[PDB]
């Protein structure tokens, strides 16, 4: 239900 | 316009970001580009 952020 | 299976996600954060979760792709980068 939770989809992961990119970094920057 | 993107291939098939590519989630264009809006978040919060303020950045846009690919989601391709066969793998799981969260990546920067148009993948048609």
Known sequence: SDPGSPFQ | ???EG???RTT???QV???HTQT???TW???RI
């Open chain 2, 6 to 8: 590519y989630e264009q």
């Open chain 2, 24 to 26: 799981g792709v969260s």
């Open chain 2, 12 to 14: 919060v954060q303020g």
């Open chain 2, 29 to 31: 980068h148009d993948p």
């Open chain 2, 17 to 19: 970001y690919f989601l």
């Open chain 2, 1 to 3: 316009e993107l291939p």
